[PDB]
Subunit: 127 residues, 2 copies
Amino acid sequence: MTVQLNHTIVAAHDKKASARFLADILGLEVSPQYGPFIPVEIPNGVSLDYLDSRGAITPQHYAFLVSEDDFDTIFGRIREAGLTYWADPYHRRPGEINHNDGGRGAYFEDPNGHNLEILTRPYGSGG
Amino acid sequence: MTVQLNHTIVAAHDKKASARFLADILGLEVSPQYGPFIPVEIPNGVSLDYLDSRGAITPQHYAFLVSEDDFDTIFGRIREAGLTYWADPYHRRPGEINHNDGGRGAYFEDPNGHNLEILTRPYGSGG
Ligand SMILES: [Fe+2]
Ligand SMILES: [Fe+2]
């Protein structure tokens, strides 16, 4: 079944600032507002649709598989933003990257506390 | 940038039952457990990784673009499960489908309250 994940909603205090944060960090573009959402289209057919939140925002986890050249570019923008990054999902190792599955990866936070991850090889792969 | 959304985490009371629920309803398969996660691979390169939750589960929204033939099949399974479905995201119209953008769509809930949506044409399209 040619099923695709088409979108998920990302709760945000400032949906426009939060969508721009993700779009800028990943080298993508923000879409025009659609209803109450600010969508960010990810190239594999799914959009992260930012919605103004009320009350506490439960942190979600969004992990992006990126090319090695994109890893270097994204990593540059993270450092330029003065953001702490971590090798590990539990944030024990700030200022380091992991090398899972022969790739490279790191975790960081968006303005709402969502846990963003970049990785260059799929979990459990290596070739 | 060939960036892909690779995975997100889905909080669940019973990660195995919840992953099986989604896999069965969409006609997909559940992957072997990886760490604490039960992944469900969606064909466009993203997995929904089910994780045992503690405390309240904040409902998330996962929308799947499906073929028209898959819509009929999935809709059949929803009815066979005795699940209420709704035309609208606010759940005002039970037992009806929407026809957004010349397609067909409906909303329903997973065992944790996550808001699942199926649609056959992308939001804002029609051709
Ligand atoms: Fe991850
Ligand atoms: Fe939706």
